[PDB]
Ligand binder design. Structure first.
Ligand SMILES: Nc1ncnc2c1nc(Cl)n2[C@@H]1O[C@H](CO)[C@@H](O)[C@H]1O
Length: 385
């Protein structure tokens, strides 16, 4: 029943996803709001603790007590230059507890501090409760994914988050390995298969090159930009609309925090529309000083606004190819991961770089990792019996 059941969890920087393999198919489980992906946010309020969508929805009103980016802190020392640099950009407090970072917040009127693994355990608990609500029984066996460049300390702190959340962690697998499993790239029989995983998410960009030799996975190279993702494209749209508002009304909205945030959420939505339509409309009632902002943008203008950012994704691809000591024609498969890979210009740039090659993109790219983790979790739980 429950003991013979296992889930796959993609524990992401900005979003998390849970899948289950049953009756010969993967089901990506929707949360109580009907979304197949859940924001990796935890909010601490005057009455409750919020996780996911509810936490992300109140981030504007409560920024000091809304934690996100815990994955950037997990398994790291407070003194680590990555931690010290990132701390300057978060609205929540990060403190030092014996060279280990803790997030300090106000919760139900009291000062509380949490280890990053305790924050990630709250995200994992939510994913576990989403699976339980779908299945009708508690499921405790799980496969949890991590980036391929995570070291032993980051892998151990992820497994600890899983333990705190009440999960029996069957395995910690690499995100690009879960993605190649999703496409069945480890079931092509004999001979070494070279796979490139292009993973463009909300806040990070990762390129991974894997060799799959008779079912055995080997990471040949990892490259990328830890501070490049979908949120940089939204900000490029934001800047354009702030400048358009200034030209139409002779008014600078940039200092109005509420006006900028409503513009940001509308830009994110418009950006997603631009992946399937050649234009998108913004309909913001009373944006600033009672002025409605009803405008549109083409895909061609959006592509111009992000042109340099889209082109910058090809330098880590080249870098990963040289590190792996492989030419373009030696790559058998190209896999797309992350919601941002839905952008047509991104796909065209990657396909042109690989000389007109077909891309593996039939599985929702923001769900491919959870999909593969769910397949692995089913195989692992069957072998355990
Ligand atoms: N249709 C889309 N067109 C463009 N960007 C998209 C799309 N869907 C998502 Cl999710 N994203 C972005 O992916 C990230 C999460 O993986 C977020 O930045 C989201 O906006």
């Amino acid at each position: 029943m429950a003991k013979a059941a296992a889930i796959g969890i993609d524990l992401g920087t900005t979003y998390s996803c849970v899948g289950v393999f049953q009756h010969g198919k993967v089901e990506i489980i929707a949360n109580d709001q009907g979304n197949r992906t859940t924001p990796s946010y935890v909010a601490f309020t005057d009455t409750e603790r919020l996780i996911g969508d509810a936490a992300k929805n109140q981030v504007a009103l409560n920024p000091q007590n809304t934690v996100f980016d815990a994955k950037r802190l997990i398994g790291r020392k407070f003194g680590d230059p990555v931690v010290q640099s990132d701390m300057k950009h978060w609205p929540f407090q990060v403190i030092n507890d014996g060279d280990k970072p803790k997030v300090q917040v106000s919760y139900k009127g009291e000062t509380k501090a949490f280890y990053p693994e305790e924050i990630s355990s709250m995200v994992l608990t939510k994913m576990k409760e989403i699976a339980e609500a779908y299945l009708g029984y508690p499921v405790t066996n799980a496969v949890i994914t991590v980036p391929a460049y995570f070291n032993d300390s980051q892998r151990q702190a992820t497994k600890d988050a899983g333990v705190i959340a009440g999960l029996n962690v069957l395995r910690i697998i690499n995100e690009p390995t879960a993605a190649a499993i999703a496409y069945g790239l480890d079931r092509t029989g004999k001979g070494e298969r070279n796979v490139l995983i292009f993973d463009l998410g909300g806040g990070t960009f990762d390129v991974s090159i894997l060799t799959i030799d008779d079912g055995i996975f080997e990471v040949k190279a990892t490259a990328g930009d830890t501070h490049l993702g979908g949120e940089d494209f939204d900000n490029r749209l934001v800047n354009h609309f702030v400048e358009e508002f200034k030209r139409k009304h002779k008014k600078d909205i940039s200092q109005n925090k509420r006006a900028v945030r409503r513009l940001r959420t509308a830009c994110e939505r418009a950006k997603r529309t631009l992946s399937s339509s050649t234009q998108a409309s913004l309909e913001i009632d009373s944006l600033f000083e009672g002025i409605d902002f009803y405008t549109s943008i083409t895909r061609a203008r959006f592509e111009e606004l992000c042109s340099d950012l889209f082109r910058s994704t090809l330098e880590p691809v080249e870098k990963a190819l040289r590190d792996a000591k492989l030419d373009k024609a030696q790559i058998h498969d190209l896999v797309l991961v992350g919601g941002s890979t839905r952008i047509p210009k991104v796909q065209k740039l990657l396909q042109d770089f690989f000389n007109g090659r077909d891309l593996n993109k039939s599985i929702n790219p923001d769900e491919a990792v959870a999909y593969g983790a769910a397949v692995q979790a089913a195989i692992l739980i069957k072998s355990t019996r």
